[PDB]
Amino acid sequence: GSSGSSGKRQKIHLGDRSQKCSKCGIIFIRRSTLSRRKTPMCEKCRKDSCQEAALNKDEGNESGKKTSGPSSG
């Protein structure tokens, strides 16, 4: 550990995409998502979609978002 040449390796990009949530009001990065609600919700809130009615959670089903090409083999 020692002071060397001025910091060169810099990979800092702009930060606009960042959107302010409406439910909680946290700062997050809006990413590709299937338009469902007409409001800026952060990943955190999104999870609380309030859909899971039954106490159960998952009995052998891994919810996967649309991906390039179907799933076959």
Query: Cβ(43)–Cβ(27) under 8 Å?
Result: no
| Minimum distance of Zn ion from residue 53's CB (angstroms) | 22
Query: Considering beta carbons, is residue 48 or 52 the nearer one to Zn ion?
Result: 48
Query: Considering beta carbons, is residue 26 or 29 the nearer one to Zn ion?
Result: 26
Query: Cβ(45)–Cβ(23) under 8 Å?
Result: yes
Residue numbers 14-73 binding Zn ion by CB under 5 A: 21, 23-24, 26, 42, 45
Distance between CA atoms of 69 and 33, rounded to whole angstroms?
17
# of chain residues touching Zn ion (CB under 5 A): 6
| Minimum distance of Zn ion from residue 58's CB (angstroms) | 23
